[PDB]
Write a protein that binds this DNA or RNA. Structure first.
Ligand SMILES: Nc1ncnc2c1ncn2[C@H]1C[C@H](O)[C@@H](COP(=O)(O)NP(=O)(O)OP(=O)(O)O)O1
Ligand SMILES: Nc1ncnc2c1ncn2[C@H]1C[C@H](O)[C@@H](COP(=O)(O)NP(=O)(O)OP(=O)(O)O)O1
Ligand SMILES: [Cl-]
Ligand SMILES: [Cl-]
Ligand SMILES: [Cl-]
Ligand SMILES: [Cl-]
Ligand SMILES: [Cl-]
Ligand SMILES: [Cl-]
Ligand SMILES: [Cl-]
Ligand SMILES: [Cl-]
Ligand SMILES: [Cl-]
Ligand SMILES: [K+]
Ligand SMILES: [K+]
Ligand SMILES: [K+]
Ligand SMILES: [K+]
Ligand SMILES: [Mg+2]
Ligand SMILES: [Mg+2]
Ligand SMILES: [Mg+2]
Ligand SMILES: [Mg+2]
Lengths: 446, 442
DNA sequence: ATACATACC
DNA sequence: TACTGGTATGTAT
DNA sequence: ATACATACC
DNA sequence: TACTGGTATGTAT
């Protein structure tokens, strides 16, 4: 089914008829170049699954036994270090962009809406999700699913502004909170909770926009956070409260929209939560990882744990280590400060460009935008990468690393232009037929 | 209603079109503000007509002599020695999109969004669809209309390809926008008289050879543009820029027109020319002059004395140049810019903290634009449009120049603060904000 | 170091 | 008519 | 120097 | 559902 076939792994999308919805998507997508490319990618994934299953058939009882012991040794060390003492909160705005648009055009409140264009949606409101409409779906497809759908263009500066208002509230509870995008954040409220236990009602009191008082527990802190967000912005958030970031993230989606959920911070509660948790609900387990694990009979975190020996023989160390943490209900119990960025990039999609001189011009423009962006943070990098996507949706990237760092439109373009030239020359006399180009700079000195 | 002063919009059922536009527009906030602006123009027309009725024979006679004196100097210096070309791409953005998606060449299309179109192709223009009209209205006029989102970087790239051709014929050509330019081909015509066929042969992408006349040069330019970019241009040839621009529109699209450089050809062209065809005569000026019985450049000349009493010096000087078929005969290099701005429309913002943040973001973009050209300025102006489409601008000027996001924002935020305080306790209900910097050291 | 894929919002 | 854009990282070479 | 209006693409 | 954005300059205070 790939990308196109409805992805219901999002809040507010339970109980839909994927057979009926996918017939509509397929009718709207039939014969397109996008579809052609999706079939190619699906066949790739299936080959990868086949290679894993062939490797699996070679595994013997002896090997599995040995892996089992080595994995259980590592699990014992993870288990002994389990930290249940931090209160991690994940805050996540409800239908963020759509909610802002509905707030400011209340005629939209009772309608199914989405934000974006006929080419692409960035989100949808909860009414629209009941028709299968969602982020990453083209608007023209969404309209087939929901003829009455209102598609609203984005107002990115508004969303940055709302986000600033939210973050100012969040800073009160964890001044080192980790903002992930505009609409979500992790907080460690451990310290705050400790101080809060001796705060008089005056420091936990808010007037409505007659006053209200919030208690001293974690659930009360998060009710206070949500209340302040709603009062300041007129928008709701959901929240998860858990002993680590992995669990808190799963929890914040659970009672969406306008809800919250806490896993009590005792081991038994964690394990009972994780027990029948579908792995697709955990951050980092995407469509492909899900498909590969499903081939092994793995759908839930219990199954993930049960097959840990096998996973240690079929997946890299970074992957089976990650799976084992999930399967034990472990994750980060402290938040790290936003580090040095490793890359910066710009890319753009367009109607077909096939003339070499126009491709060079496009490349130069992208190099200039990217130089402007680097200038803002005074960064310089040693590696320039171009990205080309042809009209059949096939992506290539072509990188070059240089001895001395670069920053200016001129320097970036002198590298990118050569990378592009090499591609134009390779297909000659056939023009490159492009729908997207991008330029990325990386290898900043650390 | 339908502003039909464009190529391809001749002989439309404007009755039907204006009904559809009007059903789509009446009752809106937009329409409310249009009525207010139309009333202000009508008031301005009424003030003028009441002034006109007080003008004496003696006043008219004194004006007439001053204007005739000024017209003598203008006529004396009439310069017919330069061949000025105006090049203008046909349906520019739409043509680019049709070029690169074959399914579109036989359909009505427009470029932009459901909120706003930047242009339309000639098929769509037959339904009254055009630039400056919202796509949602265009779709009522033309259900089958294809609205293509813009690809601005492609248009810039095509413009570069076009400008490279134009530099062969006049290296000091003046680019006016992405799709249009003025060239002075006088020098090139001198050189070209003695050029062998080798220097005037271009192959189709079979050879083609072009002659030595101005018309043949412009054919050669238009042929080259179509071979390089796959798009057509129209062109106007004339002794000055004012006339050249009129001519480029005359046989649009994919056409060409010349006014030969003799006084008589200029006057026969100008004679029954509707004034609205001249660049700088917009809707408002046209309506005011129509109120005086002025539709053509002939009528504009005749009422020159009256024009000098009813209009500022700048305006009647300008009208007089037009009525004599005069204009620029040498093209200046693009001088120092006078300002830089950014503005943006959004769904309603009414919370003061959000308004400050938008102002901040706008100030950063603007500092970024300035940093690119290393410019600093002393005047910062904010622009606020409310949900009833009313525009306010508020400026402040400082001693020493500024350029950083912080400096620009320090000034802008106090201007915004003043507007928020003046309406308190009612919030400002905005649909647009902008920031502009000006007063560069020149 | 480079190419391509996966994942997230 | 029309299938996004920015950053990090995993996998494989 | 400031505010608002017109014009162009 | 939905009426643009950038620059210059004219009109009036
Ligand atoms: N594929 C995508 N492409 C572009 N923008 C996207 C996107 N996915 C999301 N965004 C933008 C638009 C989103 O509004 C915003 C936050 O992402 P979420 O928190 O994942 N989604 P939301 O808040 O809408 O709904 P809820 O949390 O209740 O499920 O990021
Ligand atoms: N009101 C507007 N708003 C935004 N962009 C606009 C615009 N009007 C035009 N443009 C953009 C899009 C336009 O394509 C481009 C050139 O403007 P023209 O030469 O005045 N119009 P075209 O070339 O389309 O048609 P033809 O010359 O055959 O009459 O500028
Ligand atoms: Cl889809
Ligand atoms: Cl098919
Ligand atoms: Cl739409
Ligand atoms: Cl915005
Ligand atoms: Cl390619
Ligand atoms: Cl209109
Ligand atoms: Cl559309
Ligand atoms: Cl360019
Ligand atoms: Cl230009
Ligand atoms: K191709
Ligand atoms: K208002
Ligand atoms: K206002
Ligand atoms: K498509
Ligand atoms: Mg969200
Ligand atoms: Mg989120
Ligand atoms: Mg044009
Ligand atoms: Mg033009």
């Amino acid at each position: 089914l790939l990308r196109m076939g409805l992805n219901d792994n999002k809040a507010g999308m339970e109980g839909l008829d994927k057979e009926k919805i996918n017939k509509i998507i397929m009718e709207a997508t039939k014969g397109s170049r996008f579809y052609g490319n999706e079939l190619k990618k699906e066949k790739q994934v299936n080959q990868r699954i086949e290679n894993m299953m062939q490797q699996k058939a070679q595994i013997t009882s002896q090997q599995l036994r040995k892996a089992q012991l080595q994995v259980d040794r590592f699990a014992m060390e993870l288990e002994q270090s389990r930290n249940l003492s931090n209160t991690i909160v994940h805050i996540d705005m409800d239908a963020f962009y759509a909610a802002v648009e509905m707030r400011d055009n209340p005629e939209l409140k009772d309608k199914p809406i989405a934000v974006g264009s006929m080419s692409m949606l960035s989100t949808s409101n909860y009414h629209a999700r009941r028709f299968g409409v969602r982020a990453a779906m083209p608007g023209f497809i969404a309209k087939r699913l929901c003829p009455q759908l209102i598609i609203v263009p984005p107002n990115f500066d508004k969303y940055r502004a709302v986000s600033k208002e939210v973050k100012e509230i969040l800073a009160d509870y964890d001044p080192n909170f980790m903002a992930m995008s505009l609409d979500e954040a992790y907080l460690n409220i451990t310290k705050h909770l400790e101080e809060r236990q001796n705060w008089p009602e005056d420091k936990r009191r808010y007037f409505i926009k007659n006053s209200v008082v919030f208690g001293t527990s974690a659930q009360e802190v998060v009710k206070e956070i949500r209340f302040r967000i709603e009062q300041k912005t007129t928008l709701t958030a959901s929240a998860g409260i858990a002993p680590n970031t992995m669990l808190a993230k799963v929890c914040s989606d659970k009672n969406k929209p306008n809800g919250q959920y806490q896993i009590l911070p005792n081991r038994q509660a964690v394990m009972d939560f994780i027990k029948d948790l579908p792995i697709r609900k955990v951050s980092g387990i995407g469509k492909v990882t899900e498909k590969m694990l499903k081939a092994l009979g793995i759908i839930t975190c219990t199954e993930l744990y049960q097959q840990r020996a096998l996973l240690s023989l079929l997946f890299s160390e970074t992957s089976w280590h990650y799976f084992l943490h999930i399967s034990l209900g472990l994750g980060s119990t402290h938040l790290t400060r936003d580090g040095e960025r490793k890359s910066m990039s710009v890319e753009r999609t367009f109607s077909e460009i096939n003339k070499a001189e126009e491709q060079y011009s496009l490349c130069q423009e992208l190099c200039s935008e990217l130089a402007q962006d680097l200038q803002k943070e005074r960064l310089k990098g040693r590696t320039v990468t171009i990205k080309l996507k042809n009209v059949n949706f096939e992506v290539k990237t072509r990188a070059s690393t240089v001895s001395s760092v670069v920053s200016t439109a001129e320097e970036i373009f002198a590298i990118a232009k050569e990378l592009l030239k090499t591609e134009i020359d390779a297909d000659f006399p056939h023009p490159l037929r492009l729908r997207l180009m991008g330029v990325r700079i990386s290898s900043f000195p650390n």
